[PDB]
DNA sequence: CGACGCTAGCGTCG
DNA sequence: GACGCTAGCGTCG
């Protein structure tokens, strides 16, 4: 019987007015952005642009209230060593070398050079709209601001792609092979990661961080089982549509609970990696049927308190980070949102109301 | 430039 | 209400 989950999902979808209003303007601070940085004899004249995020990967929720982009320089010869046995971070050890500090090159050093042409490069079209958002620590986007029309916010990373094998801590990752076949997960292998500039502690200036921004996007597009999975000829599954809930569930938490200690520290990316595991769980597009929508959001939203319980939320990508590990995260974080998951999975779902 | 797939929005319904 | 058009944006060349 319906909750109904359809309805929730017509109001989450973005007004196609919203997104052509938000969209055009977007391209045209980024594409200007990227001509003008091409054109320089900057280090960064040979950056690629490559879109990501939620928005791109079409599951973006309300409105669209951010963008994510990256920007990706290729660089060769590349050599890297991981911090602490850290999964998540490394520093590359090693042709520009302004920003390299003691063959090794420095996030911040590199970092603060990229946001610093931004933000002057920003300066020149220079509308009262447009600005560059005052720099958070421990981030690696600089994030144009957009007051027009309305409050908007575009995230550049730096990206240093290797045409490198992926890392050790990588391997045991990625476990499509059930859901998208062996085939499919060698292909996806062989394309190139990226590095950005993100540091664990509590402080490090010079570590950078993986990036799979890239492969997401492409299973996403992709998480048909078949290949004509939710395409004109072939049955719809509602995996995307599963995702957009739980996204929304969390936002809606925070904004309509109200923000909490506890509540900040969850982000978009554990739901994202969840549904993820959820996936590899569950590799039939059967299992996924439209029709069959209510049990399965269900199932995602159980998972994730399995997970919560649990506390171990292994990277995707990388099996041995867990991103609900309790240095990473407390305890008593995990417990609140469980209950109010908690309180919400058996009433129904209101918060989305 | 130019294809096409995807998705929002809307008309028809055999 | 399920189909099935349309328009427009995103994408890889
Ligand atoms: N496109 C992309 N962006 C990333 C990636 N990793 C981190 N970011 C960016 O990092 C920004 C936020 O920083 P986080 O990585 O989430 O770290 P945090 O613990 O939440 O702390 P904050 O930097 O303050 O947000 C986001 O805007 C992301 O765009 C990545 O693999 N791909
Ligand atoms: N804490 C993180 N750790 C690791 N990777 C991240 C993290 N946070 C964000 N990313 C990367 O960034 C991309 C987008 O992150 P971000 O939260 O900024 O936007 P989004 O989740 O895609 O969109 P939305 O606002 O709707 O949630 C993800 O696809 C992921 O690859
Ligand atoms: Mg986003
Ligand atoms: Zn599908």
Redesign the pocket.
């Known amino acids: 019987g319906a909750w109904k989950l359809?309805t929730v999902?017509?109001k989450?979808?973005?007004?196609?007015?919203?997104?052509?209003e938000?969209?055009?303007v977007?391209?045209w601070v980024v594409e200007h952005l990227l001509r003008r940085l091409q054109g320089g004899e900057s280090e960064f004249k040979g950056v690629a642009l490559?879109?990501?995020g939620s928005?791109?990967?079409?599951v973006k929720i309300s409105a669209p209230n951010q963008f994510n982009v990256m920007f990706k320089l290729e660089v060769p010869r590349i050599q890297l060593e991981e911090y602490c046995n850290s999964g998540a971070h490394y520093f590359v050890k090693f042709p520009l070398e302004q920003f390299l500090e003691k063959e090794i090159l420095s996030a911040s050093k590199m970092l603060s050079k990229f946001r610093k042409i931004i933000k002057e490069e920003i300066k020149n079209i220079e509308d009262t709209g447009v600005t560059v958002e005052r720099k958070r620590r421990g981030s690696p986007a600089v994030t144009l601001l957009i007051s027009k029309p309305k409050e908007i916010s575009v995230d550049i990373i730096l990206a240093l792609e290797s045409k490198s094998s992926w890392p050790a801590s990588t391997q045991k990752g990625l476990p499509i092979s059930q859901w998208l076949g062996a085939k499919v997960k060698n292909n996806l292998k062989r394309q190139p990661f990226y590095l950005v500039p993100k540091h664990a502690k509590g402080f490090q200036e010079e570590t950078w961080r993986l990036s799979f921004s890239h492969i997401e996007?492409?299973i996403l597009?992709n998480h048909g089982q078949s290949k004509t999975c939710?395409?004109?000829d072939g049955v719809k599954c509602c995996r995307?549509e599963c995702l957009k809930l739980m996204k929304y569930l969390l936002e809606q938490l925070k904004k309509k609970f109200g923000n909490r200690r506890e509540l900040a520290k969850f982000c978009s990316y554990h739901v994202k990696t969840a549904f993820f595991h959820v996936c590899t769980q569950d590799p039939h597009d059967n299992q996924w049927h439209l029709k069959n929508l209510e049990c399965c959001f269900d199932n995602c939203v159980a998972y994730f308190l399995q997970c919560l319980k649990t506390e171990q939320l292994a990277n995707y990508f990388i099996p041995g980070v867990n991103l609900f590990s309790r240095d990473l995260i407390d305890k008593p974080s995990k417990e609140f949102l469980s209950k109010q998951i908690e309180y919400e999975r058996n009433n129904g779902f209101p918060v989305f109301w």
């Open positions: 359809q999902l017509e989450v979808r973005l007004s196609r007015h919203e997104i052509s938000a969209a055009e977007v391209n490559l879109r990501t928005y791109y990967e079409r996007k492409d597009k939710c395409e004109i995307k």
